[PDB]
Amino acid sequence: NRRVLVTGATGLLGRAVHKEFQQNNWHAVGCGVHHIIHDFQPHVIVHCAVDASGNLAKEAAAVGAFLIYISSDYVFDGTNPPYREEDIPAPLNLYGKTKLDGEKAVLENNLGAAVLRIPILYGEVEKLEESAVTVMFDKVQFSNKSANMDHWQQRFPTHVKDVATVCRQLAEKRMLDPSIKGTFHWSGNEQMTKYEMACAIADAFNLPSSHLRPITDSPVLGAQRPRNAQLDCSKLETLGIGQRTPFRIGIKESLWPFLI
Ligand SMILES: [Cl-]
Numbered sequence: 001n002r003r004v005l006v007t008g009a010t011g012l013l014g015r016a017v018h019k020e021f022q023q024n025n026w027h028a029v030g031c032g033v034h035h036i037i038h039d040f041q042p043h044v045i046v047h048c049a050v051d052a053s054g055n056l057a058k059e060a061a062a063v064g065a066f067l068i069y070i071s072s073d074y075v076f077d078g079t080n081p082p083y084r085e086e087d088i089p090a091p092l093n094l095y096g097k098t099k100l101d102g103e104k105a106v107l108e109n110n111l112g113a114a115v116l117r118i119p120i121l122y123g124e125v126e127k128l129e130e131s132a133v134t135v136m137f138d139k140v141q142f143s144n145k146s147a148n149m150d151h152w153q154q155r156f157p158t159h160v161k162d163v164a165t166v167c168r169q170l171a172e173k174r175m176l177d178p179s180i181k182g183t184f185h186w187s188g189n190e191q192m193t194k195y196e197m198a199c200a201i202a203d204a205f206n207l208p209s210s211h212l213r214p215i216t217d218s219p220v221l222g223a224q225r226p227r228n229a230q231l232d233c234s235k236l237e238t239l240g241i242g243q244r245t246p247f248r249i250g251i252k253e254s255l256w257p258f259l260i
Contacts, residue, residue: 003040004171005065006030007056008048012123012130013070013160017046020164021171034059044068044171047106050098054105057113066174067113068167069106072099073156073187075117078226081154085117085183085235092224103183114170115183116163117231123160124254133157133197133251137258140201143211149195151214154228157197158188159250165243166236173239180239185231190247197247204252205259 004021008014009030021044022028029040037045037059045060045067047053053069060067074096075089091097103115122133129135139147166186174180192200195214202209219225236242 002026002175003042004028004044004046005033005037005040005042006046006048007033011048012125013121013163014048016123016160016164017048017167020161020168021046024168026168037063037065041065043175046070046167046171050101050105053102054109057106057108057110060113061110066171066180067106067110068170069103069113069115070163071103071115071117072096073117073119073229073231074226075100075103076226076229078154078229081228081230082232083185083230084232085185092226094223096226107182112178112181114174114181116167116170117183117185118163119156119158119187119229119231121160121163122157122251122254125258128258131254134255134258136194136198137201137255140198140209140212141205141207141260143208146211146213147198148213148215149193149198151193151195151216152218152227153193153225154191154230155193155197156187156190156230157192157247157251158186159245159254161250162186162188162243162245166241169241169243170236173241184236185233186236186242187231187233188244188247191228191230192247197251200248201251201255204248205255 006018077090122131
């Protein structure tokens with residue numbers, strides 16, 4: 001009788017996490033929440049999102065639940081990759097600052113909580129817009145118009161199923177190890193720009209890619225972005241935790257229903 005509560009269970013990552021636990025002998029309940037936490041008494045809470053997060057950390061502490069707060073590589077300035085969990089964060093934008101404030105809010109209100117920083121995600125989306133990787137597909141698929149692709153920012157596309165497996169593995173290790181707490185990193189091992197991802201998508205579905213224009217210049221509009229906020233995963237790898245899907249396989253599985 002192992003119980004897990006997955007917040008944001010309707011989202012891309014939430015659905016993968018909920019299903020990973022459920023298919024591996026866990027009684028999984030998903031939220032699309034203080035009453036649910038008392039009635040279910042979950043052993044583990046996987047939070048997919050600051051005042052609410054900090055309040056959820058208190059609720060988790062009160063029932064003795066292992067809380068996993070999902071965070072981002074955007075907490076780092078991406079000037080000196082790779083980034084260890086012991087490295088000092090320096091968020092360049094509001095997204096990174098909110099995630100870092102979220103982490104602090106959780107770790108300050110729950111001493112046994114874990115933070116899992118992950119990079120750009122993709123998976124079996126219901127809508128192309130659900131992922132910043134999958135939203136590109138129609139620009140790749142249709143060659144009638146030239147399409148500018150970022151070839152400046154270094155990313156590590158990670159399958160939500162990899163993040164889901166790591167969440168379950170971290171939760172299962174914690175069950176027999178109370179030292180499992182603090183900050184953790186998980187990421188795919190393939191360094192790719194949006195242009196390199198578009199190229200990999202084109203090749204996976206045997207599509208023409210000559211209409212794709214790589215933009216190698218630094219951004220000139222919008223919020224400041226980390227060039228290479230690569231996460232090092234030695235911490236989890238030493239613990240025997242991890243799963244990594246090759247992008248060319250993971251993106252084929254994910255985008256197959258949207259091929260026109
Ligand atoms: Cl923006």
